[PDB]
């Protein structure tokens, strides 16, 4: 029943996120002024969001119609789980790295420009993706294909006992929501405070200098970033935590879980649809580079 409405809701999200992430990636990858500085974090974030869109959206819309069979073998099920988990973790850690480097850039302006190095950028990006792939392993370890006996019908699922699945999901949800959530919130709050406090020896109000609307807009954008991350990634972890808690199902519990899963998927893919916008497009520098690449072609 969810197939048609959910596909209808996803198609706008899918097209928006795909075009946004591809545009961001192309602008960063072509323009020299993006290649040189540490736009690698935003490049990785765009790649990760595009990959989560590609791997979830079409596969999920397919599986919600033909939920009964599964399309691939055990290695396909391992690759699906590993790729999806690693790109989700990579997106989360790219967001966290962007937040940390912005905190350094704002509270330690000199440290940032002295320390900024392409080698350092790629090294941190490698740590990010390495940890993402490493943490993707347990989910891939417990997952597998399952069959229905007494007659095709096969489906990917957690085969190892849910007892350990609950621990795995709780630990991953802690490390990749609660830790990065608090980190990002605290860092952007400190950045907002640093922008708030006044350099002037004597207070003034209503002055026409750009600093005032600039700092107000920056605080608003930081609040948007933190709230987008929290609201988008809370449903994602809620879905898996819910599924891991239930030992035996029933019609009403299954229906409520299906509602939760649909809404959480909407939020989760809206995450990848929105991230490129708020992180690149709403910035004047990216707009300038985008206009430049437009003009050159």
């Amino acid at each position: 029943h969810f197939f048609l409405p959910v596909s209808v809701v996803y198609v706008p999200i899918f097209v928006v996120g795909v075009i946004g992430n591809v545009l961001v990636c192309l602008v960063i990858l072509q323009h020299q002024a993006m290649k040189t500085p540490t736009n690698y974090y935003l490049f990785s974030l765009a790649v990760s969001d595009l990959l989560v869109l590609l791997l979830g959206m079409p596969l999920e819309v397919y599986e919600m119609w033909r939920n009964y069979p599964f399309l691939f073998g055990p290695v396909g099920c391992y690759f699906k789980t590993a790729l999806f988990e690693t790109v989700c973790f990579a997106s989360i850690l790219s967001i966290t790295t962007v937040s940390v480097e912005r905190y350094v850039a704002i509270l330690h302006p000199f440290r940032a420009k002295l320390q900024s190095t392409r080698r350092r950028a790629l090294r941190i990006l490698g740590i990010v993706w390495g940890f993402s792939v490493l943490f993707s392993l347990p989910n891939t370890s417990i997952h597998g294909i399952k069959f229905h006996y007494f007659p095709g019908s096969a489906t990917c699922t957690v085969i190892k006992p849910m007892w350990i699945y609950n621990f795995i999901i709780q630990v991953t949800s802690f490390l990749f929501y609660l830790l990065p959530m608090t980190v990002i919130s605290v860092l952007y709050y400190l950045m907002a405070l640093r922008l708030k406090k006044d350099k002037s020896l004597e207070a003034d109000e209503g002055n026409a200098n750009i600093q005032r609307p600039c700092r107000k807009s920056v605080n608003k954008m930081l609040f948007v970033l933190v709230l987008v991350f929290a609201i988008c990634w809370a449903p994602f972890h809620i879905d898996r935590l819910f599924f891991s808690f239930v030992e035996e199902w029933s019609e009403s519990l299954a229906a409520v879980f299906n509602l939760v899963h649909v809404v959480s998927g909407v939020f989760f893919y809206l995450s990848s649809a929105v991230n490129p916008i708020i992180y690149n497009l709403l910035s004047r520098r990216f707009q300038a580079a985008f206009q430049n690449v437009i003009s050159s072609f």
Partner: peptide, 11 residues
């Protein structure tokens, strides 16, 4: 056996 539909978590 399940008389009902049930989504799988996205992993």
């Amino acid at each position: 056996g399940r008389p009902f539909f049930l989504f799988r978590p996205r992993n």
